[PDB]
Amino acid sequence: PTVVGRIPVLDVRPVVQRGRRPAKAVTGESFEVSATVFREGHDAVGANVVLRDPRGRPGPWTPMRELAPGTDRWGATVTAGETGTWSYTVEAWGDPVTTWRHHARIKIPAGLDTDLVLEEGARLYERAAADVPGREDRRELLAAVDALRDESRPAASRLAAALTPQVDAVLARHPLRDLVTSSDPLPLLVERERALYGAWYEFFPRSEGTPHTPHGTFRTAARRLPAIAAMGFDVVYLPPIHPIGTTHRKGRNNTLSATGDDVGVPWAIGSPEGGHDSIHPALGTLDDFDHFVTEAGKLGLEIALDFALQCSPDHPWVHKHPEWFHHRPDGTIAHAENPPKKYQDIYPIAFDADPDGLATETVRILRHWMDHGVRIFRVDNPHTKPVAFWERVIADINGTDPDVIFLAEAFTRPAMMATLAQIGFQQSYTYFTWRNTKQELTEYLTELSGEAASYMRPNFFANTPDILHAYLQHGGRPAFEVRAVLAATLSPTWGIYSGYELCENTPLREGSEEYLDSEKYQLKPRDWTRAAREGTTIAPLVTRLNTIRRENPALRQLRDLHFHPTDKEEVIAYSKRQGSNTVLVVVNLDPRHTQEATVSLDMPQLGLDWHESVPVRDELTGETYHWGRANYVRLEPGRTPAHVCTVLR
Amino acid sequence: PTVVGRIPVLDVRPVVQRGRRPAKAVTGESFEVSATVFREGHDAVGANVVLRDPRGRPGPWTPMRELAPGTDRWGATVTAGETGTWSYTVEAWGDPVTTWRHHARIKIPAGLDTDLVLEEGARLYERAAADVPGREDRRELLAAVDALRDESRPAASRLAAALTPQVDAVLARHPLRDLVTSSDPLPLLVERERALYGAWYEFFPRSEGTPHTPHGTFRTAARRLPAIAAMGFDVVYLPPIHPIGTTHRKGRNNTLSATGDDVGVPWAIGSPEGGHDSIHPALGTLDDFDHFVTEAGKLGLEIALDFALQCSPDHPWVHKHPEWFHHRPDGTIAHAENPPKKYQDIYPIAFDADPDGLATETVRILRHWMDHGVRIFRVDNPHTKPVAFWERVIADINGTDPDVIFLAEAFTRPAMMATLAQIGFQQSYTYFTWRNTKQELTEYLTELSGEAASYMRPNFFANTPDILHAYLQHGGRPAFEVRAVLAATLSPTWGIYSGYELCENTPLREGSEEYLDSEKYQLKPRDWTRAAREGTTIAPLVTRLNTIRRENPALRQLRDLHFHPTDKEEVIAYSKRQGSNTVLVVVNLDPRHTQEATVSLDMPQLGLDWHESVPVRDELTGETYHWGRANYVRLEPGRTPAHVCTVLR
Ligand SMILES: OC[C@H]1O[C@@H]2O[C@H]3[C@H](O)[C@@H](O)[C@@H](O[C@H]4[C@H](O)[C@@H](O)[C@@H](O[C@H]5[C@H](O)[C@@H](O)[C@@H](O[C@H]6[C@H](O)[C@@H](O)[C@@H](O[C@H]7[C@H](O)[C@@H](O)[C@@H](O[C@H]8[C@H](O)[C@@H](O)[C@@H](O[C@H]1[C@H](O)[C@H]2O)O[C@@H]8CO)O[C@@H]7CO)O[C@@H]6CO)O[C@@H]5CO)O[C@@H]4CO)O[C@@H]3CO
Ligand SMILES: OC[C@H]1O[C@@H]2O[C@H]3[C@H](O)[C@@H](O)[C@@H](O[C@H]4[C@H](O)[C@@H](O)[C@@H](O[C@H]5[C@H](O)[C@@H](O)[C@@H](O[C@H]6[C@H](O)[C@@H](O)[C@@H](O[C@H]7[C@H](O)[C@@H](O)[C@@H](O[C@H]8[C@H](O)[C@@H](O)[C@@H](O[C@H]1[C@H](O)[C@H]2O)O[C@@H]8CO)O[C@@H]7CO)O[C@@H]6CO)O[C@@H]5CO)O[C@@H]4CO)O[C@@H]3CO
Ligand SMILES: OC[C@H]1O[C@H](O[C@H]2[C@H](O)[C@@H](O)[C@@H](O)O[C@@H]2CO)[C@H](O)[C@@H](O)[C@@H]1O
Ligand SMILES: OC[C@H]1O[C@H](O[C@H]2[C@H](O)[C@@H](O)[C@@H](O)O[C@@H]2CO)[C@H](O)[C@@H](O)[C@@H]1O
DSSP, X not given: OOSSOSSOEEEEESOBGGGTBOEEEETTOEEEEEEEEOOSSSOOEEEEEEEXXXXXXXXXXXXXXXXXXXXXXXXXXXXXXXSEEEEEEEEEEEOHHHXXXXXXXXXXXXXXXXXXXXXXXXXXXXXXXXXXXXXXXXXXXXXXXXXXXXXXXXXXXXXXXXXXXXXXXXXXXXXXXXXXXXXXXXXXXXXXXXHHOEEEEEOOGGGSOOSSOOSOOHHHHGGGHHHHHXXXXXXXXXXXXXXXXXXXXXXXGGOSSOOTTOOOOTTSBOBTTBOTTSOOGGGOOHHHHHHHHHHHHHXXXXXXXXXXXXXXXXXXXXXXXXXXXXXXXXXXXXXXXXXXXXXXXXXXXXXXXXXXXXHHHHHHHHHHHHTTTOOEEEESOGGGSOHHXXXXXXXXXXXXXXXXXXXXXXXXXXXXXXHHHHTTOSEEOOSGGGOOSHHHHHHHHHHHXXXXXXXXXXXXXXXXXXXXXXXXXXXXXXXXXXXXXXXXXXXXXXXXXXXXXXXXXXXXXXXXXXXTTOTTTSOOOXXXXXXXXXXXXXXXXXXXXXXXXXXXXXXXXXXXXXXXXXXXXXXXXXEEEETTEEEEEEEEOOSSSOEEEEEEOOHHHHTOOTTXXXXXXXXXXXXXXXXXXXXXXXXXXXXXXXXXXEEOO | OOSSOSSOEEEEESOBGGGTBOEEEETTOEEEEEEEEOOSSSOOEEEEEEEEOTTOOBOOOOBOEESSTTSOEXXXXXXXXXXXXXXXXXXXXXXXXXXXXXXXXXXXXXXSSHHHHHHHHHHHHHHHHHTOOOHHHHHHHHHHHHHHTOTTSOHHHHHHTTSSHHHHHHHHHSOOOEEEEEOOOEEEEEEOHHHHOEEEEEOOGGGSOOSSOOSOOHHHHGGGHHHHHHTTOOEEEEOOOSOBOOTTOOOGGGOSSOOTTOOOOTTSBOBTTBOTTSOOGGGOOHHHHHHXXXXXXXXXXXXXXXXXXXXXXXXXXXXHOGGGSOOOTTSOOOOEEETTEEETTOEEOOOSXXXXXXXXXXXXXHHHHHTTTOOEXXXXXXXXXXXXXXXXXXHHHHHHOTTOEEEXXXXXXXXXXXXXXXXXXXXXXXSGGGOOSHHHHXXXXXXXXXXXXXXXXXXXXXXXXXXXOHHHHHHHHHHHHHHHHHHHHHOSEEEEETTTTTTOOOBSSTTOOSBTTOTTTSOOOOOHHHHHHHTOOOHHHHHHHHHHHHHOGGGGOSSOOEEEOBSOTTEEEEEEEETTEEEEEEEEOOSSSOEEEEEEOOHHHHTOOTTOEEEEEETTTOOEEEEESEEEEEEOTTTOSEEEEEEOO
């Protein structure tokens, strides 16, 4: 038996790990299946994609086309339906009608064999008719057969009868396919909408307290939720909610020794009060947390908990499972590191003495929180734990609960970042914060929206508690506005960390990405009410961006994205589409100076002719413009960060 | 079981068809096995390649290195031995000694935990010692252990004792490997030297006749063999040696109707006198052919027969197996085509009515010629027959006779070209004749010597009976000289078609690649003796090029090739290496004007320092030069096509 079939169909994509892991989609998402298809000799081929759902049922007739002439690379778009494990096959075949037509069109005007050629077409059409289930369509092809065979009529006329539009449409729907050959099936995992699409908000409950009790509880912090819903967020990502160690606790601003009142770092998980299955006593009880989760649910908010597989020196695991830590010869456990960053307040887990026990406990913890309505976990620094460990944990949890979503906070090298997505992380943090120029943004999003999109779903946090980028530091409010726009329109998932709205941009010191007086080491109460009344918050912009997203399907996908040239380096332009919805964005990346540019749109890339002029509405302002091949824009920092335009029907 | 192992080893290369077809080498050839290797956390990894022979025996310790820092891509060179099917695996592991050393070097000068750090190194060294089979090497590591543990000695001193050269050499040969993890084996087919390396000469026996009997026989044509051997060729490729049809026979210059004495085209195979298992009666008998083959063998020449799976209208198959042809409704068979080229004199084969009978007969024909000492077949236009058909045929023949070599004359699109090589064709014709500028040559050879080298072995014919390129037409003798130099130094297999030596360059007409009075349609006697005495032949250059090839192992491989920059567009420079043999070639691609240029050698790419000045000998002239980073060359067309230099040792 041969590896290549009768009609070669090779190198089907997407493929992940050579077919050993599935390619990804979410319900209702479209993507391109491609293949290399050709045959021996000079006759034409065709191809189509057969997409199978979890019960094995084939989808609709999905014909492919050659993506560029003479390349033998064929493609077609497919669309994922319900969640679960699907499979896709590419079928290739000889296309004898297209071949016959080609020759007929030359030979009949040339008087060469006109009877023999026409009879050959007659027979092709007969075979095509036999496979057609429609009675009307069958009658139509057979009327062509009779015409082709009518030796009473001129050659040119008999041929024309076989090339009518209504003959084409029947053959387009039901082609004569010779020597049908299939690739081996490739696996596709289809997950829920939120894996790809969602707007995220991170805050620390303990900061949302009162005058009498500064350390916030779940009951007091629930009061922030309506404001977060009103900004159009879907997911609230909480830092670790557990007790916090006292041994080597850090103080304010990442000092080494905490003083009497210091609250410490939430990631230094565990004390005698409990571990990863417990609630910090100062946030309240498990019932309080259920209340917080219920109230979020009513506002259309899901909770994502932080999961940081690591311990403070006072976590019960230290004494109950010493073999989950690596001990030096004197018995001590070296504190974790991400050099030059030191984490004196925590111990990293060692996985090679009792991998099974770690696995079993890890999934039990996750299942505990799942039973309390947390169906999303933001996994802290996964790349310092074994890759195969996450592969096993995720498979175990998604085996019973396939709706659970894992976000990988892996700020590290590409190989590892890719691998973690491929072994099952539904979402990944990305290099976004370090893509600020037009070159950087264009290259990186070309990468994310291209081949990487078959295994990685990006979550664009414009800031995190650990990343306050120089661009926001030096750019002030207008920089916060630009990054919001970019994040929210370039990725169908994005997020901000509370304080972003208020344009908090004071670093620990020049050349650092840490915040001064970081919320990681202290309570950080904020006058939300004052900011709203004094208008020193960008919440209204954020709110508007999420509404636009909710209103335009094109922004709820990733893969369809195109960059349109401008004559200014500071000005970037791009479009995204989904069905008839098209969104066109132009952003001035200069946060200090007004930029005027000419934006030269790739009209065909919008599905318009070059001369055409399409009306647009800038959804940020409600203003309308008539735009075409070449468009003057003028963008003043502080007044306008960007145009975010929809193309009107 | 997880898809990723404890220490990730991913995307092992080379790979062909995702592991479904083997990668290729020949006996004694070197190539790079690579893989993506990394781990969690910040500790170091190592990796090594385990290469297995047909009996399953592992080869030598072959450590890999990271090919560029921070990339996580690792590689090592391996060398194929005896012929047959091999396998390669990549092992990845934690490298705890490299990790410990790194920290020790910082901490000990810092006075930070010196005792604990040194004791940790002691224990690592002890474990490494336990796996070392040599008693002396074991004593050496244990002496380091004792030194590391001597608390009476200064920290800096105890550490130094563990980092001596003689400790490094023991650990380099027998590292401590944690958590060893392997890839799945990948297949490698190792074939004989000639599949990769050989010089080819094509001629038509029928042209080497006499005054009394113009149509040459095998007995008269055997007289050409010594001259061919003298030119340093290894393989004589004959056009089809079978009877030739009379129905629709072509005349001189590809005219449609042959006249009385016209000999017709050898590819129009078959008459009542016999088919593909027969000898044209005018060439003599099978015994005469055995004589020709025997005499070739004694001169160090292997025969390669043309195999064209096609028939003249008078081939016996036409009536004996009509279902091997596609018939139109009136019973006729359309003559073969490769538009705008027409082959009115032949019928193409149809494969779908009796694929089994075609397979059986085809391999019987091949076996017939094999039993008469032909162990090489040049397969005519394989891309007009099914790919899976060649896959089945070749597997069948190589199953019993793995030494037989197939060369694919597939001048067609890349996908088909690649695929035919991948499904088992040992050699491929290439786009060479249409790569004449420095950009063209550089790009194309970068491609052939790169990833394509794991499945395709190129045969650079500078001309064929069907391709006389415009460059030779317009360039005259000096162009023939350049192309000979390029072909013979750029690919370890090359060839010419008789007449090339005499610089035959008259086209059928302006803008054609056909020869005037082509030998395909007529006897073409040549005054070899006169050319030799009048010196109007480039046989001496050809002879010299093959000798240089035979004397320099670098020219007998493909994959090691590097292009060195010059300040002149007409002047190209490149080097090839194999062990200590280095050949450096500089060619003036202008055939009409002298070119002077400065050749700036990538010295490290030669394995020399930038300031170094190495002696070379131009093997064309015997002249010696001292060359370094920058070198003036002056190349006059007719006098010197190129410098073909060896680096002296
Ligand atoms: O009619 C379309 C075509 O017309 C014009 O081309 C003329 C050309 O300008 C002249 O210079 C001449 O071309 C000869 C050429 O210079 C010689 O070098 C030789 O060409 C060989 C190639 O050098 C060699 O590589 C190989 O070529 C293969 C390609 O490498 C490979 O990519 C593939 O080619 C496919 C193309 O990649 C793909 O785009 C598609 O081709 C389209 C062209 O790209 C598109 O621009 C257009 O091309 C024009 C051309 O630009 C004009 O100058 O038409 C195509 C639309 O379908 O498909 C290609 C496959 O068909 O495969 C090829 C080989 O199959 O092989 C060739 C020779 O083996 O020979 C040339 C002629 O003797 O003449 C032509 C017109 O006759
Ligand atoms: O190593 C010596 C090195 O020293 C100097 O680096 C300084 C640099 O110029 C400053 O700009 C700054 O660096 C910060 C950077 O500019 C910030 O934007 C941010 O960078 C983030 C990246 O933007 C983001 O992409 C991600 O980085 C990943 C890369 O994208 C990814 O490709 C890969 O990186 C590997 C490289 O591809 C690989 O080539 C190899 O890198 C070496 C360089 O090639 C080599 O030239 C040299 O560079 C100098 C440099 O010229 C000086 O400026 O060293 C490199 C290490 O050998 O190895 C890379 C693997 O490490 O992976 C990374 C993720 O690791 O994330 C980063 C940050 O999260 O932050 C930067 C931190 O300051 O300061 C540095 C001084 O440290
Ligand atoms: O208590 C541990 C540690 O936490 C911090 O850094 C976190 C960070 O918040 C995470 O999101 C990610 O970057 O990994 C780290 C570990 O979970 C503090 O910055 C650090 O100073 C503190 O010691
Ligand atoms: O006489 C049949 C046919 O053969 C020729 O072309 C060959 C060519 O020599 C091969 O190198 C390859 O391209 O396939 C062809 C068919 O076997 C003649 O050049 C052609 O005119 C002739 O009709």
